[PDB]
Amino acid sequence: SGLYVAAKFSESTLDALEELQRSLKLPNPVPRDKLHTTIVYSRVNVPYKVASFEIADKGKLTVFETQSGNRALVLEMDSDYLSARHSYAKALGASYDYPDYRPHITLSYNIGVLNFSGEYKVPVVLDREYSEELDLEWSD
Ligand SMILES: Nc1nc2c(ncn2[C@@H]2O[C@H](CO)[C@@H](O[P@@](=O)(S)OC[C@H]3O[C@@H](n4cnc5c(N)ncnc54)[C@H](O)[C@@H]3OP(=O)(O)S)[C@H]2O)c(=O)[nH]1
Numbered sequence: 185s186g187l188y189v190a191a192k193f194s195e196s197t198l199d200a201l202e203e204l205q206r207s208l209k210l211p212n213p214v215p216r217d218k219l220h221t222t223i224v225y226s227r228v229n230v231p232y233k234v235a236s237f238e239i240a241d242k243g244k245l246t247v248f249e250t251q252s253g254n255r256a257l258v259l260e261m262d263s264d265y266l267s268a269r270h271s272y273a274k275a276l277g278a279s280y281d282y283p284d285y286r287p288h289i290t291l292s293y294n295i296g297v298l299n300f301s302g303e304y305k306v307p308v309v310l311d312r313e314y315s316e317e318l319d320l321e322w323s324d
Contacts, residue, residue: 186318187278189224189232191239191266194309201259204304205291210257212294218324221261221289221308223269226278227318234315239265240308245300246288251320255295258288259304269313293324 193201198216205213224232243259250256266287274280289308 185227185229187224187226187229187232187273187315188222188318188322189234189269189273189313189315190220190222191235191310191313192220194311197307197309200306201289201291204259204306208257208291208300210292210300211296211298212292214290214292214324219289221266221287223266223287223313224273224278224315225281225318226273227281228277228279229317230273230276230278232273232276232278232315234313235269236309237265238307238309239263240287240306242303242305243289243308245302245304246286247295247300248288248290250293254293256290256293257295257300258290259306260286260288261308263287263308265310290324 240261243261
C-alpha cells in the first residue's frame with residue numbers, strides 16, 4: 185500500500201558521497217547501493233510517473249531522528265527539481281509525513297552519540313527515480 189519514490193545517483197555522485205562518509209568517519213554508513221533521496225513518502229498510492237540533471241550542488245549536515253529513535257546524519261539540500269517532483273506527487277494526491285519537504289541524502293541511519301556539522305559542495309546527479317510500495321520498516 186501507499187507509495188514511496190526516491191532518486192538514485194550517478195557513479196560520480198556516489199563516489200563523492202562515499203568520500204564524504206569516509207571523511208566524517210561515520211558509523212553505520214549507508215552502503216553505496218542504498219544511497220538515495222526520497223521524493224514521495226505517501227500512505228496513499230497515486231499513478232506517479234517516474235523520471236542527466238545535476239539536481240543539487242551543495243548541502244548542509246543535519247541530524248534527524250528515525251522511527252526507531254536512532255540519530256541519522258543527512259546531507260540536506262535545496263533542490264528545485266526534487267521539490268517540484270514532490271509537488272507533482274502531491275498534486276496527484278499523495279500524502280507526506282512532514283510539514284515541510286526537506287530533500288536530503290541520509291549518510292547514516294545511526295550515528296550513536298556523535299555530532300556533526302558542515303557545509304559541503306557535492307554535485308548531485310540523478311541516475312533514475314524509482315517507485316514502489318511504502319515500506320514503513322525500510323532499513324539500509
Ligand atoms: N524532523 C524531520 N525529520 C525528517 C524530515 N524528513 C525526513 N525526516 C526523517 O529523517 C529520517 C532519516 O532519513 C527519517 O527516519 P525514518 O525512520 S521515517 O527513515 C525511514 C526511511 O526509509 C527510506 N526508505 C527507503 N525505501 C522506502 C520505502 N519503500 N518506503 C518507506 N521508506 C523508505 C527512506 O529514506 C526514509 O527516510 P527519509 O528521511 O528519506 S523519508 C525521517 O523520519 C523532516 O522534514 N524533518
